[PDB]
Structure formats: structure tokens, C-alpha cells
Amino acid sequence: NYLSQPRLTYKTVSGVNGPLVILDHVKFPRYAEIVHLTLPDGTKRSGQVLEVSGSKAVVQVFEGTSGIDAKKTSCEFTGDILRTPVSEDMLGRVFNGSGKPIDRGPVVLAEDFLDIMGQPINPQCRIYPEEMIQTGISAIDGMNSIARGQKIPIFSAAGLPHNEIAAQICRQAGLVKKENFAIVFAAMGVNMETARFFKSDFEENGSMDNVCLFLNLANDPTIERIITPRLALTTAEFLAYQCEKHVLVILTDMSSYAEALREVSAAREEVPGRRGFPGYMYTDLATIYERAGRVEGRNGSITQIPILTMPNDDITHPIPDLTGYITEGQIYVDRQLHNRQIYPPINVLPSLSRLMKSAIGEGMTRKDHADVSNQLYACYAIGKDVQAMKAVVGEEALTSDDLLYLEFLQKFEKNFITQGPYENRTVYETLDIGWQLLRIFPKEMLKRIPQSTLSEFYPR
Amino acid sequence: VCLFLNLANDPTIERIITPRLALTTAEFLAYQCEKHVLVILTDMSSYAEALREVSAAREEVPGRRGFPGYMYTDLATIYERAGRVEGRNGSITQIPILTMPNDDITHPIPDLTGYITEGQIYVDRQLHNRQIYPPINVLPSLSRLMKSAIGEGMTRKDHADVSNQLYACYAIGKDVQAMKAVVGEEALTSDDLLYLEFLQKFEKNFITQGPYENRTVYETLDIGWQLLRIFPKEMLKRIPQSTLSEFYPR
Amino acid sequence: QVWPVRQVRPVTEKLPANHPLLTGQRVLDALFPCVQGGTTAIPGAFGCGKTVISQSLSKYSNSDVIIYVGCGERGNEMSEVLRDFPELTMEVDGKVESIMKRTALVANTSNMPVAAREASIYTGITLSEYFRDMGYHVSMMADSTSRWAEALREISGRLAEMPADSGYPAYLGARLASFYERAGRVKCLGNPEREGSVSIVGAVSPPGGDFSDPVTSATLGIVQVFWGLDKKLAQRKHFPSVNWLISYSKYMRALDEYYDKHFTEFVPLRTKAKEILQEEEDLAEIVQLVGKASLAETDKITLEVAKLIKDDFLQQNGYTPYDRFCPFYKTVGMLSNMISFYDMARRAVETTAQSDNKITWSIIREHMGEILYKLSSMKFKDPVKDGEAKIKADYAQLLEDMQNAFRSL
Amino acid sequence: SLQTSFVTLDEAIKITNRRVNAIEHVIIPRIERTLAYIITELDEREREE
Numbered sequence A: 001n002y003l004s005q006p007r008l009t010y011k012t013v014s015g016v017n018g019p020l021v022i023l024d025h026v027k028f029p030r031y032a033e034i035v036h037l038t039l040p041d042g043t044k045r046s047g048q049v050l051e052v053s054g055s056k057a058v059v060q061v062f063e064g065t066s067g068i069d070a071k072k073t074s075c076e077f078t079g080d081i082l083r084t085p086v087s088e089d090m091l092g093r094v095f096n097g098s099g100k101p102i103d104r105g106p107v108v109l110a111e112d113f114l115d116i117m118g119q120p121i122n123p124q125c126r127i128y129p130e131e132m133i134q135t136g137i138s139a140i141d142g143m144n145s146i147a148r149g150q151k152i153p154i155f156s157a158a159g160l161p162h163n164e165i166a167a168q169i170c171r172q173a174g175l176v177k178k179e180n181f182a183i184v185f186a187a188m189g190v191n192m193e194t195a196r197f198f199k200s201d202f203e204e205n206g207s208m209d210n211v212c213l214f215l216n217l218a219n220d221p222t223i224e225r226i227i228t229p230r231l232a233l234t235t236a237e238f239l240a241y242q243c244e245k246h247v248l249v250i251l252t253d254m255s256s257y258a259e260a261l262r263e264v265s266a267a268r269e270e271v272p273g274r275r276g277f278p279g280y281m282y283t284d285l286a287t288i289y290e291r292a293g294r295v296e297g298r299n300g301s302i303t304q305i306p307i308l309t310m311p312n313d314d315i316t317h318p319i320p321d322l323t324g325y326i327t328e329g330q331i332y333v334d335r336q337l338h339n340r341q342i343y344p345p346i347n348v349l350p351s352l353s354r355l356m357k358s359a360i361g362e363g364m365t366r367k368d369h370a371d372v373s374n375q376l377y378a379c380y381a382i383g384k385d386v387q388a389m390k391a392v393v394g395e396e397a398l399t400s401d402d403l404l405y406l407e408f409l410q411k412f413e414k415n416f417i418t419q420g421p422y423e424n425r426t427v428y429e430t431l432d433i434g435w436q437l438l439r440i441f442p443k444e445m446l447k448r449i450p451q452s453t454l455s456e457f458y459p460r
Numbered sequence B: 001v002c003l004f005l006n007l008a009n010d011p012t013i014e015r016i017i018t019p020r021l022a023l024t025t026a027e028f029l030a031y032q033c034e035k036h037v038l039v040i041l042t043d044m045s046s047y048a049e050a051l052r053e054v055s056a057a058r059e060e061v062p063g064r065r066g067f068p069g070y071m072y073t074d075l076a077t078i079y080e081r082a083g084r085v086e087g088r089n090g091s092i093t094q095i096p097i098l099t100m101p102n103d104d105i106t107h108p109i110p111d112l113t114g115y116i117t118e119g120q121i122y123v124d125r126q127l128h129n130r131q132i133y134p135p136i137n138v139l140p141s142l143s144r145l146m147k148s149a150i151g152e153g154m155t156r157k158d159h160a161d162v163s164n165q166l167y168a169c170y171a172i173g174k175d176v177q178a179m180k181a182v183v184g185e186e187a188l189t190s191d192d193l194l195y196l197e198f199l200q201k202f203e204k205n206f207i208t209q210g211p212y213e214n215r216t217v218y219e220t221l222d223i224g225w226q227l228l229r230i231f232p233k234e235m236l237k238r239i240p241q242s243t244l245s246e247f248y249p250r
Numbered sequence C: 001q002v003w004p005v006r007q008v009r010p011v012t013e014k015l016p017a018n019h020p021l022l023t024g025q026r027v028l029d030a031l032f033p034c035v036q037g038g039t040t041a042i043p044g045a046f047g048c049g050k051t052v053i054s055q056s057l058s059k060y061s062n063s064d065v066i067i068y069v070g071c072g073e074r075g076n077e078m079s080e081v082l083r084d085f086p087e088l089t090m091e092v093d094g095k096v097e098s099i100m101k102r103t104a105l106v107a108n109t110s111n112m113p114v115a116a117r118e119a120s121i122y123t124g125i126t127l128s129e130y131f132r133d134m135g136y137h138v139s140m141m142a143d144s145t146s147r148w149a150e151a152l153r154e155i156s157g158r159l160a161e162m163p164a165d166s167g168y169p170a171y172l173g174a175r176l177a178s179f180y181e182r183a184g185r186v187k188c189l190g191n192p193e194r195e196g197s198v199s200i201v202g203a204v205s206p207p208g209g210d211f212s213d214p215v216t217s218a219t220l221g222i223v224q225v226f227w228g229l230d231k232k233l234a235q236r237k238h239f240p241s242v243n244w245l246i247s248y249s250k251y252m253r254a255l256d257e258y259y260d261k262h263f264t265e266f267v268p269l270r271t272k273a274k275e276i277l278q279e280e281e282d283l284a285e286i287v288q289l290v291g292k293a294s295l296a297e298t299d300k301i302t303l304e305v306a307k308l309i310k311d312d313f314l315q316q317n318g319y320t321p322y323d324r325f326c327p328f329y330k331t332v333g334m335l336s337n338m339i340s341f342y343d344m345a346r347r348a349v350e351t352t353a354q355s356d357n358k359i360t361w362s363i364i365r366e367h368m369g370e371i372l373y374k375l376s377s378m379k380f381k382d383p384v385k386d387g388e389a390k391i392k393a394d395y396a397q398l399l400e401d402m403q404n405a406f407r408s409l
Numbered sequence D: 001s002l003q004t005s006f007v008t009l010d011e012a013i014k015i016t017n018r019r020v021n022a023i024e025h026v027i028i029p030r031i032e033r034t035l036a037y038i039i040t041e042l043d044e045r046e047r048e049e
């Protein structure tokens, strides 16, 4: 079962416009087919058919359209859609956003060829995730706890330390103890300093033989970003669902991915969505984010941690807004905490985990975990409401109870949220630091906690 | 004098060639006949609105408040037609006049003009309501070329130091006046009452002038020192000790 | 030789940036550092100082070569550099040399052709990479990147393209990001085994002064240093008009090993100064509503020392001989004495406040008006009329004068 | 009793008049400037669309 038929080559380019080449006189054109372009100087580029109509085909070019001409540039149509080679030998390798080697190693000798779009997994064949990942970070493991097979992004902004948060999770993550991760890492549009930081930390942690890197940098072509996450996730699906590994997948700026989609959609002159982004962007992001979880009868999993930069710090922007409707929560990194030199700058109020409710509790972690988590959240919310009042009326207007919330809020940021980049707190250390802060109040104020949990854990 | 007049009842597209006819006349007078020319352009706000009217009718890309996407580049072809050139004895000085819509300096017309011109003189409704004349408010105003048109052999040696200390005292007096509206006079310290006295004397003596009074720079600087001496010399923290010791004791 | 301007000139390797770029400003050099190989943006409203910072950094800095690009800006400013820079000399082997001998300018003024603004940007960085390749440290100035983005918008409009935010083309962010990626510290191509760098400083001109501007908002997603200018500081004649609450540098950890060798006292002083300024910002919101009378004496000290720093450390006139350029010895020395006075004044109040007779900031003011006046006057010492030895000896004498005053309390 | 009342009542009038002034001169104008900016930016989004 091979394409043994010869490839057609055309010199029938009819227009070049932004990332797009248009051809005519093409024989039975195929949607999503791959094309190879040779420029007059002998340079080669690759592209994908975005639209077909009669003998006309529209190609997006992954390496851009500079130096293309309508007379001497020639296009070879490959007869097929984009299938990447895959193997287990891809662990301990470095590739670009096209999946070509950059480590001075050879090209991938395939164990298989997989369609970069994947294949839809039946909802009947998924397993609900309940194994808790201990990330080592108290603001996560205490209050936004992560199940193995979840998708949960870091929502951040320009100038904030989201790369240090992600790298710390890669160092510190493992299961709760009363196995280790393969890592697949995608960079879209990162600076050289970010690419050096992650790569250097995997070399210095000594774990570089259990990671696969795909790197597209801010000087690399924008249109490779369309396929970069899909190459990373097609690699993770082979490792998880054929080689039975547990995979952690990092997609380090979904905002640069969304910007590349807006370049192509604008060049195609389509009807815009919000802020000029494509009207299909929810459906596009869903085909990236839903490639995660566990399947029936296979002993492997994929966990996704995307990362976003919110333009003007606005969570209501289309990129974070659509992402919240697909992912199982978010971790929110806050400029207010960063300007105060708190690290991690995680704001627990807009942060969420949608799968923690079943990953914690008796036999899973400890029986008090839900009660401490709810009561710490409630006190921090009330502490911010007291602080916002106090900033007008001054301290002489506050009650003793308001000063307990204001003391709790200072102590919670200093002890619970502040942690440092190599400190690895267990869930149990996290929960007991939680009780040392709930000790700021008399039991009559701890109203979210049932009397059995108060009686067993408060007096210690 | 040469006059080019388009009135409120004349065609609106003449307004986009009117200032270009004037500036072409100024360039002949300055750079071929070696005159010194003063150019007055009246409501650049009417020019910019006529430009918005034309550009909207062509369905061109909008900028802020619907103005043409290229309006900065257009206004720059008007305002950069000024100055001196090597080997010719003439010059062009431009004084355009703007009406800021709803008094807003952040509106596209004053905004893009302030990015091109070498400063602005700002006329304030609050000074006019108080019947001060001219109603010039120093704080929003600027001259970018002042820094090297003043000082020893140019004007007088104190000029820069006096100017910067008047800016500092006027700005602090204005902050005391805003604070006193919350806390009342009884809460002010004796230092606040100095800046609040300076503020009141400055607007009567320095700013207020009348329409045919014509003061020298030296009269202006000595009115300036009569107001700076309201304070002890230790409060005059913009001025170096050499300038204080020479000019403050008078 | 001849090189295509839209192509990056190759290097053997890109390197971490470890050495400072010195601007001669007290703010910037102390509070918000930059590096050889760095990227910086300077957003501001009109008349904030974007040009004056760019010209001062071009006159007085540790770079070997300066490339100055003026695209979409005034003709009188290119004429200003051509007048000023030939008369101004650095000193080499005990001999003076004009700074124009190390400088090149690219002009395309606000009334020149709009499409040539793009050509100016790529010309300037290609000239900068060519001198980096000789093993030089180059600084490139772009006198407004907003004027290149505005040229992209007119051509995009006349090509009848679909826009992104505020009419700009969808490719604007990729243009900016791939321009700033041409900065860095490098091992050059070829075999004499040398190293060089390009630092890029880009001014930004947000319309109405609004930093939510698409060009500013794209740019701050890229650059590693942000010097945000404030029109309320500029209207007070407070210059450089750098807002110390919003401004930042990402390079402050890279420079740890530099200060830990050359200026081993400095990082504690920098840390204390940021805390005093942040404490004053939290007090000022209370003071504005409550009317100052409720403050503790340590808070009255904090407000007064923040005022001392804001007025006499963070402020320079660039057009006067003593503050044209501030050396890092003068900068560390000034901050050391202001932070020393703070720690002594705070100690005197905090130690005595429990007793029946006790110190207050009002007592310290009446006892120390000469020391307070001397501290405000530290800025007026001239780095070329006075010696390094004379300036450091005077700042040591102020420390003895204030210690003898606090001993007298 | 009248003098302990009078001296305590004088303080509370000053604190109250300071809040009436702060709401009138500081707090309400900041809300009105914010609300005027929002209307201006929503006109921009409508014109872009």
C-alpha cells in the first residue's frame, strides 16, 4: 500500500501574496495535500494546500514567500497529506518547528508515519483522570491540584516569570506517595534566551535523554507555528498510546500560535472573528488541546501544560477566553504579586483546576485536603475585600476580625504562595503549612470546614 | 503681509491646498529672496477635519476617531516646511493654531501635532474663565529649542535656572491647591502656604499682562526673581549655589 | 562587500549577555539596567525625553560604535546631532577624539517618503551587524519604531489587505520580533576567534500616550528592558521622565556577578531604594484621602526619603555640566549616603519612640537642615571639573557630618 | 461631660467632612474619567469592525 505513481511538477504559479502561492492547471487537486517548491536559485521550501477549486489550488508556504516568482519557481505535488515520521529514538533529540534535526544528528529513521492531525478517540474509550501529580508547588498542589491526563494552561503576561514556573514543574513533577515523565516541548516564536534557558536546564538536571524538543524561535518563519504543536502532539501520542509512556507536553506560547493563524486568515481575506482572529479559532485550538488524557487498556497518558501571554494582561481577550472553554482550569500568573517580588506570582483567585475534586481526599492524598483548600480560598477572598475597604477608611475603622483576615492575607502570601525555584514541597507539607495559617482564626470563623475535620486537625 | 482666506462657506477641499499655497510662497520669500518669514496657519483643526472628510469619501484605512491612517505623515509635510538652511540668509518660522475638541489634548489633532512640532503654547479655559490674559498655562506647554536659545551671550546667565525653578514652584503650588480642596486651609503647613502664595502671585504678576504690554526678556526674568525670592534659598533646589549667590540677594 | 538588508548576517554562536551598557543616567544605570547585546524599548507620550535619552546614550556610553536611525522624526534633530557630536570628544591614549569618528547616522525625516522608513530600519541593523562582525560592541538607536509600523499600515491599506488591531497589518508583530532578534552578544564568523555585540534601543510613540497601543503592546512582548516614560513627570520638568513603578529590566540577575566583583556594596542599596519608593507609593494613596496627620514617624521618614530620592537621585538635567553624564562611582556614592541617612533616621526614631522624651522626623529636620541641604546638593558635583577623588572624599565627609549629627541626638 | 463630648464630636466632624470632600474631589472624578475612556474605546472597536 504505497504511492508508487510519479509526482507531477508544475511551473503554473499565478499569484504570490503574503504567505500564499496560488497555482492553476493542477490535475485533480487534493485538500490538505503537501507541496514542495523549488526557487530559481535551487532553494527548496514546503507547503500545504489550503483551498481547491477546479484546476486552482492555494498553498501556504511554511518557510515564507520571499524570492518566489511566477515563471521559474516550480511546485511538486506529493499525492498525500502531512504525515510525520515517528520513533522512540526521538527522545534525546532537538528539532526545529518543521521537525527537521538541529542537534547535528541524522533525520528520523521511521518506526511509523503518522498524520499530524491524529485520529479521533472514541469518548467510550477514554479513562477519567484521578492520579494526582505532585508538582512540588503549594499554590498548585494545595489549591489547584493536577490529575495525570488533565489539560491546564499557565495564563501569564509579558515580563512575568512563566518559564521558571514551567521549568520548575518539569524538574519537580511526579506522583503523590503515601514512574517518571517523558517530556515533549514545543516552542513557537520564543527568543534565543528562552530556548537556551529550557535546554540548559534539561542538560543541568541530567534528564535530557527523556525529552524531545521542537524549537521555532522569533527569527524562524511564522507559518511553521501552524504545524509545530501538531508535530509535538503526534510524537506524544506515539510515545503514550503505542510505547506506553507517561508524557508531559509543554506548548510555550499559544499566543504566538494564534497570531500565525491570524496572518494566514487575513491573507486569505476571510470573515474575521473577534480582534481579527479566525472565526474557526475555537475549533482549531480544540484540535490541539483535546489531544490529551488516558485510553482504555493502554498503560500510558498525555498531560498538557500550554502557556499563554495575555496581551494588555486581559483574560477576556479571544486567546485566553477560548482557551478557558476547552482546558480543565488555568494557573494565573500575576503582575501584582511579581511587582511585590513574590515567587511563584500565582494568583489563587482566578486560578482553577476542574479535575481536582476527584484526585484528592482519603487514600488519594489526605481527608482534610478539600476543606483546607476551600477555607484558604474563602479567607484570601475575604482578605482582599477587607484590604480594598481599608485602603479608603484607614486601619482605625477595622474590627479585630478584619485584622485577622489582613494578618492571614500577609502570612498566606509570605508562607504559602512564596516558595523559591528549587524548593519541592510535598502535598503533606503544603496542607500542614495550610493549617498553620488556618490557626490565625478561632474555630467559629472556619465555617467552610466540617466539625469532624476541625476536631481532628485544628488542635495539633 | 500676504493673506490666503478660505471661510466657513468656501469649498472644504480647497482647505487641503490652502496651507500648501501659503508655505510655497514662504519658501520663495525665505530661500530665494532671503527674507525672514512668519507663517500663521489658522485652525489646523479645520484642515484635519477636511482631510478626514476627503479620506472617508475614498474608503481609506481609519486611525483614531476616524481620522486618515496617514494623518501624521500628511501634517508632517506641512510642519517640516520651516527653519534655516546653510549659505542662505532667510528663515521660515511657523505658528499653527489648533482648536482641541472638547478641550482634550489627547485627541488625534493636538496629539500628532505635538509629535511633529518643536513644542506648543497651551491656552487654558480655566485661566480665561478667571479673566486672566493671556490664558497661557505653562505646565502643558513646551519649547524644544529653548534649551540652546538662552543663557550667557544669548539672553542672561540665570534664564534656564529661573525657568526650571518657576516650573517646580508652580507645579508644587498646583499640588497644594488640589490637596487644600480635600483637607482645608487649617491642615496646611507653613511650607504649603509659601507655594500657595507663589501660585497666586505668579498668575497676577508673571502670566497676566494685557494686549499691548510688551516686556523685555530682562523684565520677564526680573519679574521671575521677584517671585522666586518668596522662598528661602534652601527651598530653590533646581538652582545651583553660584546662580543663587549672584542673583537671589537683590 | 554588499549584503541583503532583509537577511541576518551569520555568527558562529550567540552568547549570554553578562556586561552592562552604561547610559550615564542614575535611574537606568542603578534602577533598570541594560547589557551589551540587550533589547530595550522607550514608550512615551510627546515631549517625554525619548530623543534626549537616545542622544545621551549615543554621546556617553561604553559602546565602540553607534548607529543612529531617525525614521519618521524631525529634520532639526538630525541637524542637532551633526552640530553637537563633532565638538564633543572622548579621551583615548591621553589624547582627545571626536565622537563623530565612531558614529553613523541614517535619516528619513517625517516629510520624506513613507516606505523608506522600513528601508532605514533594515539599513541601520545591517550596518550594525557589519561592525559587530569586526568584534565591536555596537549600539543601534531607532528614534521611533511606531513610525515604521505606521508605514506598514499605509502600504497594507493601499494593497487593500484585511487588518489586525487599529488598522495595522496582521504581520506587524512578526516584523518587530524578527527585527529585535538581530540584537545579541556573539562569537563572530571566521577565524581570528573574536566576539562582538549589538544592543538595540527602540523608542515608541503611543498615540494619546496610551501604552495599550498595538505597537507598544507587541514591543513589550519582545524587549527585555522597558523604560516607561510619564507625561506627569515631564510636565513637572522631572527628567528623565522614567516611571519607576511600571519600568523594568529582565537582566538584573545576569549583572549579579558584575556588581559582586566591581561594586560589591551596590545590590543592597538598589534593593532598599526600590522598597522605599514602593512603600511611599502605598503611603501616598492613604495620605491623599486621610490628610497626612495619622502617619507614624517611620512613615514620615519614608515619605521624606522617598521625596529626597525622587527629587535628588532619580532626577538629572541632561543640558548642564555636572549632570550631562553621571559615573557609576558618583551614582553608587550618592545612593549610599541617601540610604545611610534613612537607616540612621529610622534607627534614631525606632530606638527612642518608647521613651517619655523621643525623636521625631520634625526634630531631625530642625537638627539636620544643613545635612538635608548637603544631601540635596550632592548632584551638583561635576565629574570633570571635580576629580573622582574629590567627589568621593566629599561624599565621605557628608557621612562623617551626618554621623556626628546623629551622635549629637 | 459637655467638654469631653465637644472635644470628641469636633474630631468626628473633621473626619466626616474630609470624606465628603475626598468623594467629591478625588473618588467621583476618577470614576467619571474611567467611564468616559470606556465609551471612547467602544466607539473605536465599532469603527474597526
Ligand SMILES: Nc1ncnc2c1ncn2[C@@H]1O[C@H](COP(=O)(O)OP(=O)(O)O)[C@@H](O)[C@H]1O
Pocket: B143, B144, B145, B147, C044, C045, C046, C047, C048, C049, C050, C051, C052, C053, C239, C240, C316, C317, C318, C319
Ligand atoms: N534629560 C533631560 N534633561 C533636560 N531636558 C530634557 C530632558 N529630557 C527631555 N528634556 C526636555 O524635553 C524636551 C522633549 O524631549 P524629547 O526627547 O524631544 O521628547 P520626546 O521624544 O519624548 O517626544 C526636550 O527638547 C527638552 O527640552
Ligand SMILES: [Mg+2]
Pocket: C050, C051, C073, C143
Ligand atoms: Mg521624538
